Amino acid sequence: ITPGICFSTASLVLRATDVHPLQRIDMGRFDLIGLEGRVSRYEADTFLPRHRLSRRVLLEVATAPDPPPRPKPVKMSPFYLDSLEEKRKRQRSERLERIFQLSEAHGALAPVYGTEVLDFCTLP
Amino acid sequence: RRVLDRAARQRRINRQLEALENDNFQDDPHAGRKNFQALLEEQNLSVAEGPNYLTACAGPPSRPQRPFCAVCGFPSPYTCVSCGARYCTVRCLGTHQETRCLKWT
Amino acid sequence: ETEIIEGEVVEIQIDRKVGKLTLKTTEMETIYDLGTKMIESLTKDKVQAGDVITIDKATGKISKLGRSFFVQCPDGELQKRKEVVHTVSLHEIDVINSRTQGFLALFSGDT
Amino acid sequence: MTTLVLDNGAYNAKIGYSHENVSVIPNCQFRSKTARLKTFTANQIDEIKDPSGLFYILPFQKGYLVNWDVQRQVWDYLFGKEMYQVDFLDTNIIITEPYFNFTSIQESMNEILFEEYQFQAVLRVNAGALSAHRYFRDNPSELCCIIVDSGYSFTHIVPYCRSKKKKEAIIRINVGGKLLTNHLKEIISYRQLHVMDETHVINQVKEDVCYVSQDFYRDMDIAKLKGEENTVMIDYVLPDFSTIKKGFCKPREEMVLSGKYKSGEQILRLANERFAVPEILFNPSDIGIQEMGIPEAIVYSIQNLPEEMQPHFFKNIVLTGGNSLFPGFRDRVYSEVRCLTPTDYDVSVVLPENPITYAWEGGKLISENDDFEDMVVTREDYEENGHSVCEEKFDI
Amino acid sequence: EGEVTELTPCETTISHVIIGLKTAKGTKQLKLDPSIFESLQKERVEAGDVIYIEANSGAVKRQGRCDTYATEFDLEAEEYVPLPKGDVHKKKEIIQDVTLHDLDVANARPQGGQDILSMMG
Ligand SMILES: Nc1ncnc2c1ncn2[C@@H]1O[C@H](COP(=O)(O)OP(=O)(O)OP(O)(O)=S)[C@@H](O)[C@H]1O
Ligand SMILES: [Mg+2]
Numbered sequence: 001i002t003p004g005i006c007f008s009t010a011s012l013v014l015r016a017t018d019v020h021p022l023q024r025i026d027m028g029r030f031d032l033i034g035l036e037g038r039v040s041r042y043e044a045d046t047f048l049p050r051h052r053l054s055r056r057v058l059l060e061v062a063t064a065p066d067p068p069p070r071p072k073p074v075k076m077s078p079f080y081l082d083s084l085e086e087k088r089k090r091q092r093s094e095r096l097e098r099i100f101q102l103s104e105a106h107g108a109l110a111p112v113y114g115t116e117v118l119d120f121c122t123l124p
Numbered sequence: 125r126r127v128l129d130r131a132a133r134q135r136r137i138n139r140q141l142e143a144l145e146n147d148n149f150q151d152d153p154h155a156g157r158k159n160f161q162a163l164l165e166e167q168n169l170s171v172a173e174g175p176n177y178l179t180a181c182a183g184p185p186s187r188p189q190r191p192f193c194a195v196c197g198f199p200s201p202y203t204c205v206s207c208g209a210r211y212c213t214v215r216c217l218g219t220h221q222e223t224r225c226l227k228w229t
Numbered sequence: 230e231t232e233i234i235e236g237e238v239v240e241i242q243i244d245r246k247v248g249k250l251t252l253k254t255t256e257m258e259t260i261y262d263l264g265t266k267m268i269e270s271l272t273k274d275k276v277q278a279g280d281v282i283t284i285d286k287a288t289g290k291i292s293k294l295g296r297s298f299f300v301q302c303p304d305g306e307l308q309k310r311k312e313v314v315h316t317v318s319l320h321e322i323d324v325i326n327s328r329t330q331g332f333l334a335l336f337s338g339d340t
Numbered sequence: 341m342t343t344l345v346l347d348n349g350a351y352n353a354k355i356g357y358s359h360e361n362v363s364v365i366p367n368c369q370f371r372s373k374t375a376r377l378k379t380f381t382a383n384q385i386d387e388i389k390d391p392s393g394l395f396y397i398l399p400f401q402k403g404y405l406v407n408w409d410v411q412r413q414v415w416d417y418l419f420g421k422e423m424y425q426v427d428f429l430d431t432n433i434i435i436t437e438p439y440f441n442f443t444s445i446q447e448s449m450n451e452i453l454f455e456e457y458q459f460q461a462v463l464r465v466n467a468g469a470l471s472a473h474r475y476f477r478d479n480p481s482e483l484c485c486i487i488v489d490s491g492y493s494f495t496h497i498v499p500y501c502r503s504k505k506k507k508e509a510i511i512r513i514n515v516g517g518k519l520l521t522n523h524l525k526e527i528i529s530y531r532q533l534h535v536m537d538e539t540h541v542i543n544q545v546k547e548d549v550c551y552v553s554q555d556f557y558r559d560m561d562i563a564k565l566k567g568e569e570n571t572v573m574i575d576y577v578l579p580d581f582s583t584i585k586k587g588f589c590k591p592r593e594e595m596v597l598s599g600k601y602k603s604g605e606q607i608l609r610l611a612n613e614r615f616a617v618p619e620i621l622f623n624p625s626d627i628g629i630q631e632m633g634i635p636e637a638i639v640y641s642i643q644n645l646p647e648e649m650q651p652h653f654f655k656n657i658v659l660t661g662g663n664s665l666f667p668g669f670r671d672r673v674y675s676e677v678r679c680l681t682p683t684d685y686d687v688s689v690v691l692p693e694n695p696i697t698y699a700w701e702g703g704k705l706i707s708e709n710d711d712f713e714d715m716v717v718t719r720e721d722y723e724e725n726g727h728s729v730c731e732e733k734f735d736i
Numbered sequence: 737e738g739e740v741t742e743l744t745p746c747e748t749t750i751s752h753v754i755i756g757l758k759t760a761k762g763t764k765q766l767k768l769d770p771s772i773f774e775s776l777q778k779e780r781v782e783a784g785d786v787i788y789i790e791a792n793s794g795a796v797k798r799q800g801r802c803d804t805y806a807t808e809f810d811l812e813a814e815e816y817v818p819l820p821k822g823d824v825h826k827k828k829e830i831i832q833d834v835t836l837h838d839l840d841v842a843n844a845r846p847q848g849g850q851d852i853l854s855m856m857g
């Protein structure tokens with residue numbers, strides 16, 4: 001029994017391939033092989049074209065009050081600041097825009113084959 | 125070497141901290157009424173009984189305590205085994221052992 | 230620059246996690262308050278009183294270089310800031326960054 | 341007719357008339373070995389010529405009035421024929437009190453002021469209340485403020501609304517100028533030379549050389565160096581009171597690295613004590629006090645208060661007290677509070693030109709108001725209702 | 737990006753994760769998608785750690801502990817990192833050039849995958 005080889009290198013070498021997120025683009029917009037076994041032809045072709053969110057719907061839901069509580073089953077301003085509120089509403093608008101853009105981006109790609117095709121073609 | 129228990133270390137810390145509130149270190153040059161503790165015990169001040177002197181004391185800091193050398197003040201990686209004082213170098217350790225370790229000279 | 234702690238182990242205490250470690254040189258002795266990761270590192274590599282060890286502070290890399298009562302105990306300061314210089318070839322950088330655990334290919338081909 | 345404004349601090353008494361300027365006078369008696377039978381009172385310390393080995397007789401312990409005889413003597417000297425010639429029967433007095441002052445001390449204050457001197461009317465407030473009044477007079481648009489009173493014996497952080505003091509959120513840090521001076525004495529005595537009997541000189545040294553560091557560990561590394569690169573290290577010549585009346589710092593061009601000088605000047609070399617001593621205010625745990633520092637205490641006091649009022653408190657941080665005169669104090673407080681404050685809330689830290697006399701100016705301003713007569717408690721009302729109504733009217 | 741001052745998952749399962757990130761320019765409270773909680777737990781993110789979170793992907797990288805906690809122990813095997821200087825929320829508009837071969841090789845083999853076949857791959 002021998003001790004292992006301790007190979008020592010510069011700590012900077014281990015960060016050679018690392019790129020900061022602010023310096024690289026999202027490669028998930030070209031991810032075709034990741035959709036296989038997870039995304040179906042129904043989602044890409046029939047569902048998403050009909051039930052994609054719009055900015056208007058997102059804004060309406062965000063601005064509207066909370067929905068009324070679900071019924072139980074039955075067996076049958078001195079300290080107000082204008083600048084702070086303007087900042088907060090700008091932040092809310094940015095957050096909603098980000099939500100919309102990410103929801104559009106995360107369902108833009110359609111599978112090459114899809115779960116249904118693979119299941120149909122996959123014999124026992 | 126000898127080792128000082130937690131009570132001795134806490135007593136030394138309390139004594140050093142209390143000495144910082146002393147008015148003078150020497151005696152009266154002329155050489156010939158209450159105190160704060162008497163005032164506190166006369167006030168019969170109870171905790172959680174509304175805002176008062178005791179409840180106004182600042183709580184423990186979130187940031188951890190930073191060790192400094194008991195001899196020169198620069199940061200100290202080392203802790204003395206016998207008394208728990210911090211120190212940063214062999215020279216500083218020797219000075220601490222000769223001056224304030226064990227017996228408080 | 231790295232911080233290297235080289236000394237002789239005097240006493241190691243671990244309790245259910247908190248722990249203490251006492252190290253000595255020929256000129257000074259010290260007690261350390263240990264963190265969870267260093268406690269795990271010292272548990273994985275069996276360290277007992279009398280062993281002469283060196284610790285890389287940032288990584289917990291503990292290598293036992295003998296026992297003393299055989300290598301003589303270190304003399305000077307226990308904690309030393311050292312300048313370590315590595316000359317790394319471009320091929321080594323490529324292989325290390327080629328894949329996860331890719332540095333193994335520097336020894337077994339398989340690049 | 342006239343109104344007397346007094347800030348009975350544990351170190352300096354800010355005493356003056358409402359129609360006149362402000363005077364800073366030490367509020368303690370002195371004894372020296374150069375005088376056999378002679379006790380100096382208040383500003384008589386100017387008469388002594390060898391303040392080395394000076395003995396201090398203080399009327400305050402841990403920031404509260406506990407010695408009544410020396411305080412009475414100091415007040416009699418200040419109100420006597422020599423200083424102000426106060427006509428007690430026709431003068432109103434505004435005198436400040438420590439926060440959370442004990443009931444017994446308040447009773448003794450009321451009794452002494454209304455019977456031994458027989459003042460026409462007394463208004464006992466806190467220095468923070470006067471500072472808040474002055475700040476609101478200066479800034480009429482602000483609805484809330486937070487006052488940091490870093491004084492001789494403590495450092496309180498009290499938030500004030502327009503006409504009310506938030507007693508729930510008062511936080512005290514047991515670090516003051518007294519502690520800093522004693523710690524500097526202990527450090528110098530342990531490291532270079534015994535100065536434990538030189539409280540006056542060490543206090544002047546602290547006022548002259550100490551500063552608050554923006555980068556603590558960079559300054560520590562700079563101080564650890566040897567040679568030209570050690571810009572932090574300076575040489576201070578202690579006053580011998582024979583040919584050097586007052587202490588001074590040697591110029592950098594005149595500094596000698598070896599430390600030996602042909603002139604027989606007693607030179608005290610301070611390198612890391614310049615910013616280690618002021619750091620106790622921001623990090624009490626450095627010396628062993630398990631208490632939060634000034635910025636963390638400010639943030640805690642603000643965050644205890646309701647959410648709606650927090651941004652206003654973050655916008656009106658005011659630094660008062662002697663310890664606030666350290667170089668870099670305002671910038672350090674601003675940086676730390678900015679680091680801890682939410683990004684949506686703006687942070688503004690204001691250091692007045694004279695933080696020592698802020699409370700006196702506030703008292704003068706509150707004296708000049710037309711609502712002043714309603715705040716005070718008269719002696720005629722004192723006879724019957726006084727002992728309760730003094731507690732009732734004063735918001736101590 | 738910033739030091740973690742609070743990490744509280746909100747139970748309905750977890751509806752969302754509220755995180756508190758600190759920088760030199762202030763503190764920000766963020767509501768995270770519940771899927772990021774798995775990434776935060778895998779990265780072993782605790783209070784006092786300096787992390788960054790990608791808004792578009794939810795990726796979490798724990799890049800060490802804050803150097804303000806370097807003195808909490810006398811000997812830990814930790815990498816202590818300075819507190820970030822800028823704002824918690826950082827926006828950058830970038831232009832990056834890629835080739836068709838990069839997109840081809842990115843789709844030749846799967847990435848990640850918690851299945852046994854994916855891990856062995
Ligand atoms: N230029 C200065 N630099 C540093 N500290 C100073 C300076 N001038 C005065 N001090 C300190 O200021 C303190 C006194 O400040 P004050 O707030 O006036 O004290 P005080 O208010 O009379 O006592 P308290 O705290 O109100 S009971 C002393 O500890 C001095 O050392
Ligand atoms: Mg005062």
Ligand SMILES: [Zn+2]
Pocket residue numbers: 193194195196197198211212213216
């Ligand atoms: Zn030292």
Ligand SMILES: [Zn+2]
Pocket residue numbers: 204205206207208209220221224225226
């Ligand atoms: Zn010791």
